[model samples]
Target: TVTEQGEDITSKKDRGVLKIVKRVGNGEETPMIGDKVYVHYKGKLSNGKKFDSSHDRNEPFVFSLGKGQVIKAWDIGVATMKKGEIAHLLIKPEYAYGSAGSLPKIPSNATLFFEIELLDFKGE
Candidate 1:
């Protein structure tokens, strides 16, 4: 994750891409690899069936960037934004749960879709 980005970050990624839906107007603040981010999200499968959602749970999902605490897609995508930045991430299976899947909810080889907003973060 400690990758890089510029202003107005968003694109149509083929394999997997992060598209900024709303801008937060902060250029000096992309999450670092070790930064701890608190965010809320709604997760859905390829069929538009929502599997998991932090919004529904009424709690934010917290994790460290570039760590194993979250899925590969998040580590790669979320690290490129600032606090309050809302984005849509289209995650391919390779960047998601992969073949094993999250099970009982997410199916095998599923491409996941998410609406994520960074509420806050801690770290330099």
Candidate 2:
């Protein structure tokens, strides 16, 4: 339990995967490699400082899965997510920005928290 959050809500049961789903999606469908996925997300630091958010702009962030376009954690975690699912991912620096970090906005080795909603996807 971290302050008012009640439960610790952090689970690392899988290799390099730390995630918890808030809402399970409608079906068993999940995006495959080469699929273009859309998501609404908010990024925050461990202490609860928000860094970046696609939801603030009211647009979903689109990216190809299994590609090196996003962070490694995102590639690994999102690949297993079902459409319409809402989840929170606890990403360490290793799976996020690494030692170099994003700078200006993110510090080196900063643990990140992301609230993500898998909206939809299109297969290639």
Candidate 3:
């Protein structure tokens, strides 16, 4: 029952990671595999419970795109955003924690909500 909640700007949310609720950039560069990306994100569960937030840590995270540095959903989702774009990526359990889960940090089969902001990226 986790419907997307936000002001509409351009397009409707999609089941996949292609949807961007806010477009803050027109960089026209999608980070390819072997690239490193820096980002800030907040993650919450279906009940609107926040489990994680980069904002709280006051640092941006760095990951190598498509390199298993993060979950599959994150890699796919961030890959579609241009630098400096913020987005809401409401994802299913299969793409988030999965049926088995990521363990103590996340429970099994949980749908997660992510607020991902692309800070910067270096394309390969």
Candidate 4:
């Protein structure tokens, strides 16, 4: 179920992709090669069923941007964002879990949706 706001999210539909929904980041700046950031996120499928949620856990996930600690999708996704803002990221499998896929929740070749809230930056 795409919201009116969701429809506004730029799409490269032919590629099964959607660009970041809200770039509340200060400017067109992508994060540097190594910057730590705090974020709260919820991962879901096109069907709107949540598969994962940091919100549910009552904790924000923290990691270094561009580092290999998380999925490549996140690295690229967070780079497009900034502090004290939120964005929705639509990730294609090639940029996400890939062919190996995640367990019972994520299947092979699945497109995922993430609602991310950029909390703060921790620096390089």
Candidate 5:
């Protein structure tokens, strides 16, 4: 199945690279590398188990774009988001925790799903 965005959601693996923009942002700026971006996110496993959520804490997670500080998906996905935009991204294990998987909440070779909302950002 292909989404309106032309992303193939036909299988679990296909979703690995899926990026669906749910809401449009007010800001015209799409953050560049080295920009300090702030965002709120909710993470779940492919089975729909909640793992992490910045929204639950009512705080945004701050990170530098393309910095490799967080998961690979965040570096790639968040950079494409505009301020105030909300997006749903599917990350394959390699882009997430990989086979090692995060203990307790996540399992090995898990596919992660995330709804990330870009709040704002500060440029270099």
Candidate 6:
């Protein structure tokens, strides 16, 4: 039961190699291949600039967990989450868009912020 709070950009920054804020899912208990989920998310840069927001669009993002449809970090990160859970994922370049990055918004070797909501879950 983690709660979301707005903190200074500096305060929210992660200094570790992986830069993960919360590790809710262990490999065993996490989602496996073919698991589908409904989620809401907001993505931002280290400078606190929002780049993407499924919530703002008033739509929930649906995807199959561990299906490689999104970033590798998300596949690994969401595996640790449960239904109705919310998590803040701080991902480094290696797990994100990688060397190429995501274009003008995300720079190369930059870290990304993801505020993810695990709304529902269904196993395949």
Instruction: Give the runs in model 3 whose Cα sits over 4 Å from its true position.
Output: 1-18
Model 3, 11-86: lDDT tens per residue?
A: 2334533244565866789788888899898888867654788878888888899888787778777777788888
The TM-score that candidate 5 achieves is 0.82
Report the lDDT of model 6 for residue 74. Answer: 79
Pairs that clash in candidate 6: 25-80
lDDT of 1 by residue, 1-124 (tens): 3212223222434445545556563668788899988998887886877667896778899898888788887887788767788887777777888899877777788887777888888994
Rank all candidate structures by their lDDT, best first, as comma-separated numbers.
5, 2, 1, 3, 4, 6
Each prediction's Cα lDDT score? 0.74, 0.79, 0.74, 0.71, 0.81, 0.69
Model 5 deviation from the true structure expressed as Cα RMSD, one decimal place: 4.0
- After aligning candidate 3 to the native by TM-score, how far in Å is the CA of 76 from where it should be? 0.8
Candidate 5 or 2, higher TM-score = 2
lDDT of 5 by residue, 55-88 (tens): 6787789999988998887887887888889998
| Candidate 4, 62-117: lDDT as tens digits | 89887789877777667767676688877778777778878677777777888888
Q: Residue 23 in candidate 3 has what lDDT?
A: 55
What digit string (tens of lDDT, one per residue) describes model 6 on residues 1-124? 2222432223234432232334243223446668888888988876676478997788999999878898877787777676666778766677778889877777887777888877777788
Off by over 4 Å in 2: 2-16
Q: Please list the Cα RMSD from the true structure of every candidate, rounded to 1 decimal place.
A: 6.0, 3.7, 4.4, 3.9, 4.0, 7.0
For candidate 3, which ten residues in a row score worst on lDDT? Answer: 7-16
Give the Å shift of residue 107 in candidate 3. Answer: 1.2
Q: Which ten residues in a row have the lowest lDDT in candidate 5?
A: 2-11
Number of clashes found in candidate 2: 0
Ranking by TM-score: 2, 5, 3, 1, 4, 6
Q: Least lDDT summed over 10 consecutive residues: which range in candidate 4? A: 3-12
**Cα lDDT for residue 124, candidate 4:** 76
| Residue 107, candidate 2: C-alpha displacement in angstroms | 0.9
